[PDB]
Structures are given as C-alpha cells and as structure tokens.
Design a protein around this ligand. Sequence first.
Ligand SMILES: O=N[O-]
Ligand SMILES: O=N[O-]
Ligand SMILES: O=N[O-]
Ligand SMILES: [Cu+2]
Ligand SMILES: [Cu+2]
Ligand SMILES: [Cu+2]
Ligand SMILES: [Cu+2]
Ligand SMILES: [Cu+2]
Ligand SMILES: [Cu+2]
Ligand SMILES: [Zn+2]
Ligand SMILES: [Zn+2]
Ligand SMILES: [Zn+2]
Ligand SMILES: [Zn+2]
Ligand SMILES: [Zn+2]
Ligand SMILES: [Zn+2]
Lengths: 334, 334, 334
Amino acid sequence: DADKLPHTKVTLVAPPQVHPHEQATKSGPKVVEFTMTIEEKKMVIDDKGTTLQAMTFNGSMPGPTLVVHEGDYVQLTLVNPATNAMPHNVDFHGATGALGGAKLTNVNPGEQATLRFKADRSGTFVYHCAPEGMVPWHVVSGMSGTLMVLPRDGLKDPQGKPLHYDRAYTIGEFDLYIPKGPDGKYKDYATLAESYGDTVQVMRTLTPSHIVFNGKVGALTGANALTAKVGETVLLIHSQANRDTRPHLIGGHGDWVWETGKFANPPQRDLETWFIRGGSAGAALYTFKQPGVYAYLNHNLIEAFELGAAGQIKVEGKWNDDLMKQIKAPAPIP
Amino acid sequence: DADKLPHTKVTLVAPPQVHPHEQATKSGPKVVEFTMTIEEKKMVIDDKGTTLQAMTFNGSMPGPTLVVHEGDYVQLTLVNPATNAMPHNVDFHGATGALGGAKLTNVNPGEQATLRFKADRSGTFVYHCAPEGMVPWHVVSGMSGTLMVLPRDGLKDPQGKPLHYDRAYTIGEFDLYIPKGPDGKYKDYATLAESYGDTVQVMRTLTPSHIVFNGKVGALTGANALTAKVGETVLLIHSQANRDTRPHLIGGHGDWVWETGKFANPPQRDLETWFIRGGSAGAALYTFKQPGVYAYLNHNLIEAFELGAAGQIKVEGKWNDDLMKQIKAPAPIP
Amino acid sequence: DADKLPHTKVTLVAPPQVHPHEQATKSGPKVVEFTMTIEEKKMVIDDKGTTLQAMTFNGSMPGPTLVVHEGDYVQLTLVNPATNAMPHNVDFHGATGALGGAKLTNVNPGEQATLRFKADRSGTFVYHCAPEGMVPWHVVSGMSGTLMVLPRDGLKDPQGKPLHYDRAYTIGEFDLYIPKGPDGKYKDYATLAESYGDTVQVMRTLTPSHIVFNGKVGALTGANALTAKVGETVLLIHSQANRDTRPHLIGGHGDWVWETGKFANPPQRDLETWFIRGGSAGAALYTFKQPGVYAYLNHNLIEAFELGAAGQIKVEGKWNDDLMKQIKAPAPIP
Ligand SMILES: O=N[O-]
Ligand SMILES: O=N[O-]
Ligand SMILES: O=N[O-]
Ligand SMILES: [Cu+2]
Ligand SMILES: [Cu+2]
Ligand SMILES: [Cu+2]
Ligand SMILES: [Cu+2]
Ligand SMILES: [Cu+2]
Ligand SMILES: [Cu+2]
Ligand SMILES: [Zn+2]
Ligand SMILES: [Zn+2]
Ligand SMILES: [Zn+2]
Ligand SMILES: [Zn+2]
Ligand SMILES: [Zn+2]
Ligand SMILES: [Zn+2]
C-alpha cells in the first residue's frame, strides 16, 4: 500500500542534464514527489530569428527528465499559472489508467493538481500534454519529456550481467510546423492562440519546417555541446513524442541500445543507427574510446543538417592509433 | 501430403472481430477452407462526406482476418463477381511461391480461383491484392487484411512460458490519397476507373489525405469502440499493407508485442509504442488493469487526431488506486 | 599491434555482386587493403531520361561492398582524381573515431589518403562521404555503400547454431531529389555545382522525386535481375544511408534477418517485411524453396512501383506443390 511508504522529494534539473539519482539501489520503494510548472512562451528556434509560439513543462523543450525506480510511485504536482492562456494536463506513458493521468490532471490557468501512479515497468517513457481536442498542437509546440524508470538492481545486458552509465544526457527531438505568409517568410504571432489555425494547416502536410534537439537549431552544439571523457559511459536518452527519428553517433556506436526504451528487454549491441518511434523514448549506452568532437544526430541527414536535428559531444582524452590511424595524410596522387 | 489431411471449413467474420478459433490445440494439421468475395464500392471515409472509390475483400476494410495453425494448409476460394469492373488477385505474405499466390489467382470480373498453400510459419501476415501494373492502387484503395498463423502449442513468452488472449481484435490502418479539384474540395468519382489517374498523382506526393482505421474516421470510436473488462487479455492485430505506423494504447501498454509480427521470435514487453512496418502485420497482448475509455492510435498524433488513425476501447471494471490515484483534484493555486 | 599483422589485398567488384570472401575462417587477423576512386558523373536514373548530377565511390551507386572479419583492420586508400570538381572524404560507420574517418580523409581533386581502422564490431555498416557543410548532398547524390564485418566463426542463429549464405547480393537504395523547372519537367544540369541550390530546395521538402535500387529505376530487373536456385541461401545486404526503407521479398521471407544489421545480436526469423533505418545497412538470409521470378522491394508500394524501389530475383528449380498449389485455375463463377 502506497500510503505506508516513505516519501522522497526530487529537485529537477534542466535538459540536457538529468537530476542526480542512483542506478542499482538497496532502497525499498518510495513515493517520489516532483513538481513542474507549465510555461507558455515565444521562443527563437533557429539562426535566422524564426519564432515558435511554444508550450513547455518547466520552461524547457523537452521538459525535465524524471527518474525513479521500478516499484516506486511517482507523485507529480502539475502547476498551470494564471499567466498562461491555455488549459493543460499530463499523460505519462509510464502510467496505467485514465489516459495516462490526463483525465485526472486537467488544469486551467491558475489551477494545479497532484497525480500519483505506480511506476511498475522499467524503461524510458514519454510524458506529454494531452488536452482533449488539441493534443497534437500541445505536443508539437513543446509539451513533452521523459520519465526514466530504472530497474531496482540497475541495467542488465542480454546475459543478465550488470551495465551502467557514468553520465546521463536527455535529448528531446521536436518536429516543428511553423507557418509562412504569402511572402514566403515564417509568421510571427503575437499570441499562442493566434498561431493555432495556421499551424494546424502546416501539421496536416506532415512536413516539419524545422526538426530540433532541445528547442532550437544548435541547442547542443558548440559551447552547448555535450561533454565526456575517454573511458566514461554515457546514457543518451532520446525522446520523440510525435514523429520517428533515427539516432546516430558519428565516429561512435550504440554499445547497448534499447530503441523501444524498455529495460526488461535485452538491449541490442554495436548499433550504427537506432530507431525511436514517434510517441516513445529510447536509450543508448556508449563508452568513449577516442577523443574529439562527435556529432549526435538524426540520420535522415536532411532532417539533421538542413532542418536542425543534430548536436555534438566534445570528448577529452588520448587518441588510440590501434582503433584508428591516418596512415597517409591527404597528399597529391602519384 | 496435403491430400490425405482432413478438410475443415471456416466462416469469416467482419472486422474488428476475428472468427472463433483455438490457440493451443491437440489437433493435427488440416486443410482449412475459406472463401472471400471481392466488392468494389464507393465508401464515405470521413465526417464531412468525403468518398473513396474503394476496393475490398468481403466488403470491409480491412478484409477479414483468416486464422489457422502452423502446419495447416490455407485453401482460399477467391471470387470476383461480374458486378466488379477490375481484375484482382491475392498475395499472401504468409505463403511461399508465385508472388504470394498472386500469379495463380488472377481473376477477371465473373471469375474465381482456389489457391492452396502451406502455412509453415507462425505470425500475423498481410494478405493483399496485387494485379500487375496496378499494385499500389489496389492496396491503398482497401484490398488488404491479415492471415494469423498460430503456433500449434499457442503463443510463448521469451522464456518459453505460455501466453494467451481472451479476445482478439483486428485493426487495419489505411493511408488514403483522395484527390482535390481546383476549388480545394475532395473529388467525388462516378466510377472506380475515373479515380485512377488523379489518385496516382496524390500517391506520388507520399502525403495521405486521410489515414483511417477500418475504412473511416471514427470506425472504432464511440458506439463502435472496442470493448473489454479488467482482467481480460486482448490481442490487438494491426495491419498496414503500404505505410509505417506506430501503435499506442493511451493509459495502457503492449505487455507482450511482436511488432514484426512473427511468433517464433521472442516478444518485447512493457512497450509504450511499437512499430508496424508498411507491408506487415504486428500483434500486441495487453491485460487491462483499469476501467475507462482508452484510445488506441497511431502515435504520430497528427496522423491520429488530424488524419484519422485513432480508435477507442471501452473497459469495464473496478478502479485501482494503487496503480493510479488523483491525490489532489484540479483546484486554485495557493 | 596492427603493424605486426599480415597484410592482404582485396579486389572490389561492382554491385550487386560482392567480392569473394570466406565466412567462418581459421585465419587470424589481417590488415585488409582496399582502394576506391571517386567519380562524379551525370547518370540517367529513369526510363524517361531524367538525369542526376551524381557522385560515386568507384563509379557505382552504391559503392562496392567491402568485406572483412571481426578483428581485422580495414586500410582504405581513397583517391579523388583531378577530373572531379568537389572535395570528398569517407565516414565508416564501422569505425571508431574522427567522425568515422571523415576528419582524416579530406581529399581535394587530385589528392588521396589512406585510412586504417580496426573492424572490432561485426555487422553490415554504411560508409558514406561526409564533407563539412555538404554532407546530405554528397550522400543523396550517391556516395554510400556497405562494409560487412563477419564474425570470425561465421553467422549464428539465436541458439548459437551456424548460419551461412551460398551467395551474397548488395542493394543500395537511393532517395533522389531531382528539381523541376516552371514547365514541370526535371532539370538537366551542365555541371554538378549548378545542381546544388535547386536540389537542396527539393531535399528540404523531404519528398524524393525517385527512390531507386542501385542507381536507377529497373537496375535490378529483367536482364539485370538477381539470380538463384532452389536450395541456395542468399544474403541480401540492404543499405540506405539517408532514409528509412522496408524490404520485402514477394513470395518469400526473411528466414533470418538482422534489420539493424549487427551480427552479435540474434536474428529474427520468418519476417515478411523488415526495416532498415536511414543511416544503416541490414542483412537477410533466405533459402529459396520455389522457382520463379520474385520481386524484392521497399514495401511502401508507392515508393516501390511509382518511385522506383523494386527489383527482381529469377530463381531456377522444381516447383513444390506441398508449399503451394493452384487447386482450381481462374474460371467462370458457378
Ligand atoms: O555517420 N555520419 O552521419
Ligand atoms: O499517449 N497519448 O497519445
Ligand atoms: O507482397 N507483395 O508486395
Ligand atoms: Cu498543454
Ligand atoms: Cu502519448
Ligand atoms: Cu484488386
Ligand atoms: Cu506485399
Ligand atoms: Cu563526396
Ligand atoms: Cu553516417
Ligand atoms: Zn527510487
Ligand atoms: Zn563507467
Ligand atoms: Zn488449425
Ligand atoms: Zn486470460
Ligand atoms: Zn578477414
Ligand atoms: Zn547453403
């Protein structure tokens, strides 16, 4: 019975980081308490100044990643401030019943609610807003993120041997549908409500204007690149709440990958490219063996390089000539 | 030798139901006999009165699901009445040889044929019409369904333990390509033949005008919702003969899923969203634990809510506060 | 240490063939040496005379398949003749570090370089050109192929039992983005450089004008059909460096399939249709049981029959009435 369990309180952190947590643990089940506050805002999503009338959990795309263990109960307080214009809610794919909790968390601006559900299944799961009649709009405008439910004894390989990560990053990939006017320029809307009708028209074409990691072209590049060192294992959590994507690490691999994102299933190894189904979150482990700047992208290379679905990981350490060596540098042909 | 085996005769039923059958069985192999009659007809596919010049097996989209056991022989009589305008045939993905049987079942209006093949592989398999030179048109106009070949000893989990369903539903998802005229309204064609050239032009854009379960927007919603009770296991058979989709049960999961649809492979568990490749049928088991109305949809939410790829399952029984509880209902913020 | 190993030299062959190689082998690791020469050229890609300003490894789309064993080192010499206009390089998904080798193989026209990397992971892996700032263009214009890294003891089934192929074919599937002018005809460009800006515009729509196997509509059909005999096992290597596809053998199956293409993972059996993620190569084994002409295609049937993604395999041998029999030929209805 959940009433008798100890309660713990978790402080969320902004993507691409993930809040401190244990993997394998000796702890018994808890009611883990989180709070998120919805923020509607206009956001600049590319280098040329295009805006999106956006909607977010906790001010970021994606929302923050919530982490518990299998057997825990998630208890979320969802706050919709009066400064917002729209009603909202939350649908946890990791939860059982009531349209993922959507039916029990309908909050108008100035309202809040508290949902509890049992995280009885391990994996990365999408959570997203789902107000009746406007579900796709809320999702594609930015209202999604990941619940990671770790097995109580940590991750396991196909033979039941222990797996771990030394650092976790969360990447949300957003297919955006920004309208254009008669002049072929992207439209800038004074309010969220005014963007709706034009946006639905773009949505129905099924062609994104932009596809971005973490809310904007270049969000995870240059100074905002992910980081690691040779010998460190990274978990890359990839969520896509609306559309398929195909993650790849250039110069790397998915050492162990759960592309459907459910940890009770054996992972696949040595992947070049994996597949996240629209409406899901997946997870890949990789241990870096070479230093340098890696690209982490959607391997529809148009979607990556033209439309925005690409980032970087800057990796420190010592080059390894056994794994790779320039035998003869570029030089004239004999 | 198939000539020495007992023959049985099966009466098909309309989707979303599936005809009575055994899962695990003590029976030896049989020649199982079915008959289907092709019906070309104009069908209303949405709420605003849009029509499709459709083609069907047995008058429905999808065609009915045929169920046998591994080692059985399927013996289909395919009837093409003289009231039809086009030639037709059938390609069983579950069969070996002759383009799935297409080469041996070419039937002009007023003709019929009888095909036999050995169902030597377990799984859900697409069957579809495939006349030379017009294959995509016949498929996207509605001529597909599922052959389910159960293992003789029933479904099994990754550890070889028994799995079962208490009820089976079949869902066919149809990407439609309805042309529009200069006024931006959908075209209404007097005959099947007249729809062809305009439709091929829409097809080549790769953008469906509509994507529907079972032949129309809302076919599996409201009064036509699927049904179940808490404690019952449902098999959800999902076919898509032309285009990828990503099934999800809102507030539920795929407890055991064969997304490529082939039962000799271990299923995956705890899926939020699975993937049916265009040209295949997949299958998911789920045991309901909460009552209420669930949505079962393609989790490209545009494809679902805007274009039509969504239905409902109405589930009876007792709410379970351990799995989910509204701790604090929506109420003003402190 | 790679310097102490024996060097071997391999002569590449044109797709759809694959160069002679061993599967299971008693040989220890080698440094296997290959050379490829880039050729930019205009190519006719369909029946109506449409051209593509193409870019290739070794004059073909796809490039040739390179085959080694796990533990070998690949040592490629990449030649960019002075007759080419653009700089190029190579990114091996099978390699670790330096953006797959791209950073160490930047070659202007008239230059060459030699890369070595350790093929420490078994599977089929994409290789492709990846010049900074122009990656998608080089890829979609034809610069990709497959590195197959076989396990030293050959392929294995889920229970660790031996698998083999008697013949291997390599199929590269290319989503092309050919621009049109104001008259609705495809544009013909005098040079590679001139095609760029118009092509990027088509790319950004995400709608291919054509999707072809091995560089052109019908490349693997009629006289250029693949061949086999009843009782022979074929390996079908399928690469797609930019966009998803869904291979299917009409009248056949994937007997054992590694759709993510990584041989240390158990294969799936009895597949009707499998899924190659954009940015990957997959592999399927099939043993023919019936003679006749099979179609091997992308089972988005529009992509196959309308846009070009389909070929044929002509199979010799004796028909098998147990697997399939025309019980009653097409004939009038009673
Ligand atoms: O593997 N570079 O897209
Ligand atoms: O999980 N609701 O799309
Ligand atoms: O299975 N014929 O597309
Ligand atoms: Cu919302
Ligand atoms: Cu959802
Ligand atoms: Cu037909
Ligand atoms: Cu088919
Ligand atoms: Cu190049
Ligand atoms: Cu790549
Ligand atoms: Zn915990
Ligand atoms: Zn570590
Ligand atoms: Zn039977
Ligand atoms: Zn039951
Ligand atoms: Zn070798
Ligand atoms: Zn053999």
